[PDB]
Amino acid sequence: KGEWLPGLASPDYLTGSLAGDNGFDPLGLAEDPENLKWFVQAELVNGRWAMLGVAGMLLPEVFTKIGIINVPEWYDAGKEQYFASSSTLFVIEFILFHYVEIRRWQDIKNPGSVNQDPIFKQYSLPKGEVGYPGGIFNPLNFAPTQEAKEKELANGRLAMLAFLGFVVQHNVTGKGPFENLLQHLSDPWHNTIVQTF
Amino acid sequence: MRDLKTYLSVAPVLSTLWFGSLAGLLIEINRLFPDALTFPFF
Amino acid sequence: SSVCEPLPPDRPLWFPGSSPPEWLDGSLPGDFGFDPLGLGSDPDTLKWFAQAELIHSRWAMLAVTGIIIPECLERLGFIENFSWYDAGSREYFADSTTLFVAQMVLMGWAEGRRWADLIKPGSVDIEPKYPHKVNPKPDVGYPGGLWFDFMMWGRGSPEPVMVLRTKEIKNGRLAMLAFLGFCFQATYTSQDPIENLMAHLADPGHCNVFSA
Amino acid sequence: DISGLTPCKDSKQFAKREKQQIKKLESSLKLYAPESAPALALNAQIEKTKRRFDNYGKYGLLCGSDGLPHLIVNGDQRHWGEFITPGILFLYIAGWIGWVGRSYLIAISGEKKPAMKEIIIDVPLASRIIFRGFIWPVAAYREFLNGDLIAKD
Ligand code: CLA
Ligand code: CLA
Numbered sequence: 001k002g003e004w005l006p007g008l009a010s011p012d013y014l015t016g017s018l019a020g021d022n023g024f025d026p027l028g029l030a031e032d033p034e035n036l037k038w039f040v041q042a043e044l045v046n047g048r049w050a051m052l053g054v055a056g057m058l059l060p061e062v063f064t065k066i067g068i069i070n071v072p073e074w075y076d077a078g079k080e081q082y083f084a085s086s087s088t089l090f091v092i093e094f095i096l097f098h099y100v101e102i103r104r105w106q107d108i109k110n111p112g113s114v115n116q117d118p119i120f121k122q123y124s125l126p127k128g129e130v131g132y133p134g135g136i137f138n139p140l141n142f143a144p145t146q147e148a149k150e151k152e153l154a155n156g157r158l159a160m161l162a163f164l165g166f167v168v169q170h171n172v173t174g175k176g177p178f179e180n181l182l183q184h185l186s187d188p189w190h191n192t193i194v195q196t197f
Numbered sequence: 198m199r200d201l202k203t204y205l206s207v208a209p210v211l212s213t214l215w216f217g218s219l220a221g222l223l224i225e226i227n228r229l230f231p232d233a234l235t236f237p238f239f
Numbered sequence: 240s241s242v243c244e245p246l247p248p249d250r251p252l253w254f255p256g257s258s259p260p261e262w263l264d265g266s267l268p269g270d271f272g273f274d275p276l277g278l279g280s281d282p283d284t285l286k287w288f289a290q291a292e293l294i295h296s297r298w299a300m301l302a303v304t305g306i307i308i309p310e311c312l313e314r315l316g317f318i319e320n321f322s323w324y325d326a327g328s329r330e331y332f333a334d335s336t337t338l339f340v341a342q343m344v345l346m347g348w349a350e351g352r353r354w355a356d357l358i359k360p361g362s363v364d365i366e367p368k369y370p371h372k373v374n375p376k377p378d379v380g381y382p383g384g385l386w387f388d389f390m391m392w393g394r395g396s397p398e399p400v401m402v403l404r405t406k407e408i409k410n411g412r413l414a415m416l417a418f419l420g421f422c423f424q425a426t427y428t429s430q431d432p433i434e435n436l437m438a439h440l441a442d443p444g445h446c447n448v449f450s451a
Numbered sequence: 452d453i454s455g456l457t458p459c460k461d462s463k464q465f466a467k468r469e470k471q472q473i474k475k476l477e478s479s480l481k482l483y484a485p486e487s488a489p490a491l492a493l494n495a496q497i498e499k500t501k502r503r504f505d506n507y508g509k510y511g512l513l514c515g516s517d518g519l520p521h522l523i524v525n526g527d528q529r530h531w532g533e534f535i536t537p538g539i540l541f542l543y544i545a546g547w548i549g550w551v552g553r554s555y556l557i558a559i560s561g562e563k564k565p566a567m568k569e570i571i572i573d574v575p576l577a578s579r580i581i582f583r584g585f586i587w588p589v590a591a592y593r594e595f596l597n598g599d600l601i602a603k604d
């Protein structure tokens with residue numbers, strides 16, 4: 001499905017069946033098919049978590065600057081005092097993430113294994129493809145068409161690099177992302193990476 | 198040039214080219230960042 | 240009409256009376272058998288070296304133009320303080336390092352498309368298709384195209400294609416040497432090329448390289 | 452202050468070592484004219500020495516009674532930059548090399564006479580294989596899980 005470098009050919013292991021299959025495997029990582037179907041899931045989950053992360057560390061900032069709601073800037077957001085401790089959050093984020101991630105693990109190991117509740121055994125999940133559970137993960141029931149999966153993976157690949165840009169625009173700049181965007185739009189030819197270094 | 202690229206592909210010529218490039222890299226790094234004993238960049 | 244016919248074996252050589260090498264039959268433009276060392280033995284690499292010569296010559300031609308024409312305008316009184324070998328040190332916006340990375344991005348796109356042409360000819364095709372019309376398959380380095388052959392001079396309209404490509408290559412080899420002269424005699428004289436020309440034309444005998 | 456070592460920005464013996472080396476360089480600097488080239492090289496070495504000692508001060512190095520930067524390689528986060536952050540940076544690069552030279556050896560393993568590619572390295576094949584080892588850790592991980600890392604004899 002398309003090609004990322006027209007001078008290069010899509011490898012034989014990327015047949016275009018998968019969503020987002022522009023043939024980008026220059027370093028031959030998904031050459032074994034097991035690695036391919038594992039890295040599909042790793043891409044989907046890193047991209048979905050990156051979308052949530054970017055949306056949770058940028059949208060706070062574009063609302064802080066305009067003054068709609070004041071909220072911290074994602075790096076001074078840890079040191080704030082919350083209704084629990086700094087580690088209690090880690091305890092909960094371990095207890096009820098181990099359960100959901102090991103069930104996703106059992107799904108990406110064998111697909112039809114884990115779809116019904118432990119407690120309410122009637123409320124099963126439909127037999128969707130791996131990495132796309134559906135059911136209560138689809139309450140509005142927007143269809144998982146291949147174009148939608150491609151849109152998912154594209155926004156996710158974009159949000160991953162956006163998070164990387166955030167980490168490196170706080171590691172060697174010191175300021176937030178949206179402040180860096182306003183600094184770029186102030187004078188684009190004088191507020192870039194090749195002025196900081 | 199045919200059969201010169203095969204000679205330059207040979208293990209000693211290729212090793213001296215690789216290690217000359219690598220040694221120049223290390224040498225210029227030590228010029229840029231001399232006297233290093235820690236990695237403080239994190 | 241458009242075949243890229245080569246030069247004959249009894250063509251003019253760089254060194255008359257000498258034997259041209261067997262890997263310079265004449266398929267390339269500007270083939271005069273220049274190979275004292277024989278760097279174009281492997282034809283799969285001689286193709287890359289022909290593309291290298293072509294692009295090198297085109298850049299050298301645009302460069303010698305951008306050196307001598309603007310110096311003529313400076314002598315005419317259009318541009319101030321012009322000196323090509325100090326025109327990178329002088330002031331612009333964007334610090335000359337933001338300019339460099341923007342240049343590398345844009346020229347990376349352009350030269351990457353050209354690279355994809357070189358590795359596999361039909362990958363990056365341009366001159367968009369039209370119904371019931373066939374755009375001719377071009378050669379590497381001479382894409383033709385609506386963007387690079389808008390006057391349709393490449394398929395052999397005013398002159399044949401071989402003599403026009405030979406014109407490109409010979410004019411451009413001359414420009415490559417002109418730019419080498421620029422890069423050498425602007426540092427061993429620390430002066431202007433056109434100034435050096437008028438200085439040698441003043442007294443050709445004693446105003447040569449041996450004075451300095 | 453681990454292992455009974457004062458930090459190097461606070462150690463008097465470290466500053467004494469700095470001053471001793473600086474005086475040793477200045478005593479060699481007097482013999483040359485202040486504008487001459489040996490003198491300028493000695494002065495550049497003097498600033499190099501001064502900023503070297505300042506950088507060993509600021510990077511948390513610990514100095515002993517002898518007054519020399521000791522490396523705490525145990526695992527304390529304050530000194531990861533002494534051993535572990537370089538060490539990973541070694542195991543990456545080293546594991547690049549071995550993952551490249553191994554992969555190359557697997558790519559020229561299926562030739563007729565595969566020994567004439569050991570001594571005459573296929574630069575195109577080697578250049579294709581070299582950057583495969585950029586993200587080598589995931590390839591080695593998966594090949595360990597897929598069993599392709601260990602030959603089955
Ligand atoms: C095995 C024992 C050993 C060890 C551990 C060291 C360790 C060290 N020596 Mg000693 N040395 C040794 C043996 C050893 N040496 C021997 C045998 C000799 C005699 C030949 C010397 C002679 C010697 C001298 C004369 C000097 C050192 C110096 C150094 C320091 C190196 C600083 C440097 O340039 O690296 C900097 C780092 C590099 C060069 C690695 C760069 C690698 C490249 C750029 C790739 C990395 C990026 C990569 C892409 C990954 C990025 C991640 C991601 C984005 C992809 C370091 C403390 C120097 C020093 O500072 O003194 C303390 C110095 O002046 N050593
Ligand atoms: C970018 C430079 C460049 C390149 C790659 C080529 C490539 C080619 N030329 Mg062209 N040529 C050039 C510049 C170049 N030429 C210039 C400047 C002149 C005029 C002086 C000519 C005049 C010329 C003639 C008359 C003919 C060719 C021919 C050829 C082909 C065979 C030779 C070969 O493979 O050499 C490969 C060359 C290189 C890889 C470049 C050499 C690089 C090394 C390191 C030496 C550089 C140092 C140099 C000697 C410094 C000059 C010193 C100064 C005092 C003069 C090949 C397509 C023959 C042909 O068939 O035409 C198509 C032919 O008959 N060339």
Ligand SMILES: CC(/C=C/C=C(C)/C=C/[C@@]12O[C@]1(C)C[C@@H](O)CC2(C)C)=C\C=C\C=C(C)\C=C\C=C(C)\C=C\[C@@]12O[C@]1(C)C[C@@H](O)CC2(C)C
Nearest residue numbers: 025026027028046049050053056057074077160161163164
């Ligand atoms: C999951 C993710 C980010 C998740 C972020 C989250 C939850 C953020 C949460 C927070 O911010 C909030 C909301 C609020 C703050 O108060 C708290 C924190 C906690 C800070 C990023 C993944 C980020 C992942 C990244 C950047 C991955 C990049 C990978 C690339 C470029 C891969 C390239 C290649 O692998 C291919 C594709 C194919 C190979 O063949 C070739 C090569 C070239 C090797």
